[PDB]
Design a protein around this ligand. Structure first.
Ligand SMILES: Nc1ncnc2c1ncn2[C@@H]1O[C@H](COP(=O)(O)OP(=O)(O)O)[C@@H](O)[C@H]1O
Lengths: 334, 334, 334, 334, 334, 334
């Protein structure tokens, strides 16, 4: 898009708390596409996407940053899990699924951008028109998110699976290097598709990836663990935060809810407490804690039409009970 | 549907004895769909289904609650066994089978809702009409029941199958996270499909599921073991209970049967006795015990037209004989 | 059909010697279909087939009872071996093959039930007419015989194959529980298909089957070993018995044969003697013994037109020679 | 055919030396088809083919007897190796290949039996005409030869392959028991297809085959080893014997050859000598010995037009040299 | 093409630094095609391509020389990883993918070489016209690059994979020897396709390849390791070098950058330093170092419109910081 | 063809040096086809091809003799590697690929044998015309070369692969025995296809092949190792020898080269020296040595237009340097 790096980050800031480095890395990556378009031949086709490799713990915004990025750029997105390819599925599926994603994007945008009348829905839908467009979207703005790419790295005492793993990287090369893949909508060039690979790299390191693949993931960026304070912001700041979602849902029932300031600190404190006591699943822990919290009101909201319900610290401690501190309970409920 | 949580539970109560927590959890889940529909963009598409994970022993109503739920909501249902995916079958089959289920639902409802005349059965059946409808049903009201999801959790001394198991969870992610799957009726978005996963979690715990999947199963609910008293109610209270079924079947033969109060306690006592002496298969034990009980009358009902047969405690003890107390017999017969 | 349990058993008696319990179990099962049809909604669709599990030694009439049952009911039958499913074949094949079987049944019955003229064979054969009929036959009267279902039960020191075995039961569930399967003739509901599972259960017990599958095989019935006296009756009583078959075959050659009373006792005595001395293969042993007996006359019948040949005890002892008592010979010849 | 057992054996005698028992067994089997056709319903469809199991060493005429049998009966034949089925191929292929074989038989017989003119080759070739005919041939006269069926028998220390082997027998059951298989020419009933199974049964015995399969191979017959005297007859008596073939081939070159009486004894003596000194491959040994013998004359026959060449004992000893007695040479050359 | 060896090398020199031997080997190979075309039958079809085997370390120009070669010759190129073939993929895919590559080359060249007007894009696009052309391109000028062919060589303690590896070479033979492969565009002869195989041959040697394959890789050539001085030239001399690319990208932002002489020595010194301290990935190391260097300016270039930025030694040392010397950092960042 | 054995060998002599026995064996084999055609029914179809098994070291002319044979007979050829079949590929592929080969042969011969005019290329190309012809070529003159057939023989300590190997022979039987295979051009009878199997038989012997397959490879012939003197002749005598090829290639550049008598002895001496010092790859060694020799002149020929270059002993010793005697070098370069 015509958006500048800072404008892209400003947009990302409204959905993702923190992770400024990753926000900048993807902003740059998206801006480069615009820059390349301002170039002239023969340097235009020589310049390829600077794929990004995100390094960070689980549930801190890696995928979300990528999803959001694709959203604000109005581009075809696709998430895939690396280990998925170690019969089975062929990597080309990635580009295939991605072209489908591009179809919806093109369809809903075409038919909508041109308005009993159902029998006259065509008059714009040219079988070749849409196919070339979907292809065009994928070839020029396609974004592929490759999760757990650190799990296809040679682990310890190599050989056995470390032969199958590297085979996955190997099979990914044609895609990140620039290949032509066949899809039900025609051929697709992967040359300018932006690739975002992710991994925790707890044991494995990026230098463990086969060399041909390291060179195709030039941009290395780290995402940080989230703090209780971060959970606090996430709960209320991002567009469509959990508190805003629940507030809107109860409203359809005639119930007006409100979270006091400390009730939010309490919720975030609960999530962070379970992650550090058991397994840290990051921001995701916020989902179960909120559901546990909104359990009761969610079920009986229909019987409280016209009421305002204040969810304060007391309400939160009541709803959570002994769950947070008792692993026997938390490992089931949260 | 327009049904409120309490109305949904009231309906569930007429088919399932007990399990109030699970009945509430699914009621909420179904009501949320209605609520989301009352929202406005851009918060409407941001709100996703709060998938449910049922935790409980075998044969206590987990699936039945899900089946019934789909029934009362007039929605496409599909049951699948997790371990089924560890060539083989691809998870997308789930969404494929589910779209077929949606086809029948749409067909039988369309042709019926619009009435020699066989050659004029069309005049409503538009190849595109039904396909978009079936797709619409699945995308907006689809319900998937994933049984034994605790068997695809990393067991002990991980690795070997614990690599294949988690691969299943991994492959399930795109579905529970929101993917587009191709089906003979067109593309299908799984974004708003309600997922109900089930497991006994005797050894494994929900916290053992990969994190990306925990976050997509926010609602955790427990189902309880059933008591002899519960078996008692099940035998006669639910719509189409076993006693009501047998009574109606014998009636077609001209035989009027009746179960005395204690005969029912005796039947339920027998089932509960075998489950606690051998393997507890819950309510299912009621099927074999009833068949053993109705064996004789079922075969000769044709020769008793016009008779009323009272099945009392004595009749039950006679029909069961030594089966209940002799494992050598019970493990074959019941 | 409109046939009563006793009428069904009377018919079965003319093909199968003994096994009264199994004859009654299948009679009941077939009668239930008629009964369910006399019911009214919504109890009509709630009542499902009471599948049968036959427990008994090999070659005593399990399959034959099922084959015959399908015959007298004019219904689509299909036999399948359980272990067959442990790439490979998918259980849906069962329903697919079963629908084909239903096609022949419908075709031969339609074209025949409506009578140079070859070019006018149509005028009734409507591509949609037959397909809906075949589907209808399978959905309403389909019968599936699942042999060796005890071989897919967890054996000893479980795990290894006991994981693959139970997977088979698991994959069978959708069929016995009620699923929709796609076939070249359209979709097929397995909801009202009657399932008859068989097994010797020498080591494994029915209680070893996964619980979901036990509940779907409510009727447990035992078949007994056959005696020399039973072999005696089988040789001459059932319609199309072996003696009647051979008598009719030789007659086409102009040869009239007759078995004296003791010649039959001798034949049955021979079969029973080999089964108890080596491996008991039940009634099947009667096939080889009869062939050994009719060997000579069968070859030269063409040269004996106009003759009556009396097969007496002496003839039988001559034809059999030392085979019965010498395992070295019997294990090759019989 | 209308041929009697003795007429069938007389025909077989002109192609196969010895093996009177096997010749009689297949004659009977083929005659039974005719007999069954003389029967009336409902005994007609009840009578099934008496499949044959041939027991004997390699290269003594088992397959040849079956090939010839199919020839003289003008029926679709197909040879298959059992172990072939232990992805891979599905047994149904057998019936598929067999239907193709039936196509050629029907085509060449139809177009031929009805006579620039190439553009008028049709006027008889009705796409449905031939397909129903080919189907008819296979269903009524099809013959399947199953070689090495003793290799799919449970060997020693069962389990491992003895599980896969018996699976083959299991998968063969539907075919020998009577199934319907789909083929590019339509559905095919295997009910009346005659099956001839073969095996050396050196270690395994027929009683080792699963019981369901023993019963479907009622006729057991043994083929004997061949003697030097048998090799002697084979070399010159059967239609298209090796000597007759070579005599006709050299004649096209203008060379008249003749084998003296003792030259033939010498050739047969050589073959029998190598089989008993190394590995006995039966009659097949006659192929290599004849080729070694005719090597020289075969190459230079073109330069001997007009000559009569007498192949006598001296010629044979010359051509064979030291090959027969030197295993180092015989294992390469013969 | 009509280009002479020296003209081809002169062209290669503008993209690849060093590697004169490999540049000559491919120049010769490409010139031979022209020479063969000047020959007359029957010597014309007897002369086959002198395939090349490149021996050298990773990231020194093996693939690039091949890519460039295909470019300057306007020929269909395809890169493939040998181990990729050890279900899976069939080598024929190589020729299939290669024919697709040839399609784009032909299309873009045809429609372009012949010029509202969109509905009149045809008038040249003959379905058969393009297919025969694409086929023609592949058959006459096709170039296949087979990477890591030394990994399919029998390693140590042969057998296990050394059986699968050599199978790959075996399956490659038909292609390098001259085969006909089927593709969606028709049949394709691989007879005159130039094959370039590559490998590091650190342990394995060319003499380890199966003999049939050695003979089809007649030209053996070595590529050398690159020096810091080479990295220096690569950074600025080749067309579309990294410095030229970055200069052009920033220019679209209104930023004029310039690298001082020593800044370039510093960049090349950094890359060479990391390769010799950790893992030598050759020229590829230049990608990560440049990205690390241009990180800051790349993100904020939009805010520096109108500025000239001099990237000198100081700027480079600043941007790199401690990364180069700290393996803990370099293995993540570079 | 009408060619006599001696005429066929005379033709083979102009392409293959030595191997008189193998040349005679294939000449005979090809002549037999002609002879069989001179026969009358019913002996005509009884006579089958005398398949050949070639026994000899690698690179001595086995394949070449077969290729050439197919050439001079204008017949469809196909080379296949036995171990290729141990999912994977099915032997029928052999007959399929062979029918394609037959298509080209028929096409290029038909369209050529019958002559702006491009739009009038048809008027002879009848879709059925060519298909029946290609089929006819394969059925009557098809030649299949089966390399490494000694690698599918039971090795040592049989079982493991010796079960898979023999399975290959087993699957080959239907082809060599006479089967019907389906191909995109119609059905194909393999009855008269000539099969040439090859192997080094260093450890395994022909007597190790399963008996059914020995009998179908009646003609056993040995090929000898080649001497330095043989290499000498090969370099210059065969049509399209290496020296003749290089002479013609340089001529297109304006360069006239000539090899002195001793220069040729020197080249052949070099090849033979490397084969006996390292691994003997036979005549193939001549390819690398010639390329090493012609390296320099081949690259600069363009700059020597008008020159005569005499390649004498001195030139050869110069070009080869230390390669021949230094295994470290020879195993890379030659
Ligand atoms: N609470 C209950 N109320 C009514 N019926 C029940 C209940 N629990 C079990 N059943 C009966 O027992 C069977 C149990 O299967 P299901 O409900 O799927 O549970 P589970 O998944 O634990 O086996 C069903 O056929 C149902 O009719």
């Amino acid at each position: 898009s015509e958006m500048t790096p800072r404008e892209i980050v400003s947009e990302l800031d409204q959905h993702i708390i923190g992770q400024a480095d990753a926000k900048r890395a993807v902003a740059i990556a998206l801006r480069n596409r615009w820059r390349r378009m301002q170039l002239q031949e023969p340097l235009r086709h020589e310049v390829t996407p600077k794929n990004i490799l995100m390094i960070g713990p689980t549930g801190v915004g890696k995928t979300e940053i990528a999803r959001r990025l694709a959203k604000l750029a109005n581009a075809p997105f696709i998430k895939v899990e690396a280990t998925k390819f170690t019969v089975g599925k062929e990597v080309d599926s990635i580009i295939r699924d991605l072209t489908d994603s591009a179809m919806k994007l093109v369809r809903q945008q075409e038919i909508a951008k041109n308005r009993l009348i159902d029998d006259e829905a065509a008059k714009l839908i040219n079988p070749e028109e849409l196919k070339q467009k979907a292809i065009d979207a994928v070839e020029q703005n396609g974004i592929v998110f490759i999760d757990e790419i650190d799990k296809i790295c040679k682990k310890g005492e190599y050989s056995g699976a470390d032969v199958s793993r590297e085979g996955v990287q190997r099979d990914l090369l044609p895609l990140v290097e620039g290949s032509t893949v066949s899809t039900k909508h025609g051929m697709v060039k992967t040359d300018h598709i932006l690739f975002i690979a992710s991994g925790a790299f707890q044991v494995a390191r990026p230098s463990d990836l086969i060399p041909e693949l390291q060179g195709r993931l030039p941009i290395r960026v780290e995402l940080t663990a989230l703090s209780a304070a971060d959970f606090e912001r996430i709960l209320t700041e991002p567009h469509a935060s959990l508190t805003e979602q629940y507030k809107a849902l109860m409203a359809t029932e005639g119930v007006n809810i409100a979270f006091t300031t400390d009730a939010v600190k309490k919720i975030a404190e609960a999530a962070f407490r379970v992650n550090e006591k058991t397994e840290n699943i990051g921001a995701r822990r916020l989902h179960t804690v909120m559901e546990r919290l909104m359990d009761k009101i969610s079920f009986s909201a229909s019987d409280m039409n016209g009421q305002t319900v204040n969810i304060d610290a007391a309400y939160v401690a009541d709803a959570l009970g002994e769950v947070v501190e008792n692993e026997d309970l938390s490992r089931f409920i949260l």
